[PDB]
């Protein structure tokens, strides 16, 4: 059960469906990761669906779920509930494509590196490049979650969460 890994999967599938967005369960790590992805231009944006914002959303998809009921729309309702159980809230992720028809995703791939048992930490001197430095590693440092480029600039090491390109 690796939540960060399961988010990468969802993201990828939604992309392959040519979807505009998708929801994922809240997490503070996930949020710092999405913030890297947004900052680097790999996603368009992401929203925390809390307070008044969560209400708004549920109504909308509810409305839409209700007219011309095509499959794969009630799911969002479904999803929108289990993600707000407890102290936790749903994240709405807005996907970025380059072309109007959404055939060219900003994300070519996104893959978990560090995992259970098979941890991957990089030191100051051994901070990896991704795709010749055209992609990114997302790394958890003692100064926050950031790119390999930034970790290097900050002369820091950390756990390598993911490669993205």
Swiss-Prot record:
Coiled coil: none annotated. Gene3D superfamilies: 3.30.1370.30, 3.30.1490.10. GO terms for molecular function: rRNA binding; structural constituent of ribosome. InterPro entries: Ribosomal_uS8, Ribosomal_uS8_CS, Ribosomal_uS8_sf. Residues 56-90 are annotated as: Not found in other S8 sequences. Keywords: Ribonucleoprotein, Ribosomal protein, RNA-binding, rRNA-binding. GO terms for cellular component: cytosolic small ribosomal subunit. GO terms for biological process: translation. Signal peptide: none annotated. It comes from the Bacteria. It holds the Pfam family Ribosomal_S8. Part of the 30S ribosomal subunit. Contacts proteins S5 and S12. Belongs to the universal ribosomal protein uS8 family. One of the primary rRNA binding proteins, it binds directly to 16S rRNA central domain where it helps coordinate assembly of the platform of the 30S subunit. This is Small ribosomal subunit protein uS8. It comes from Aquifex aeolicus (strain VF5).
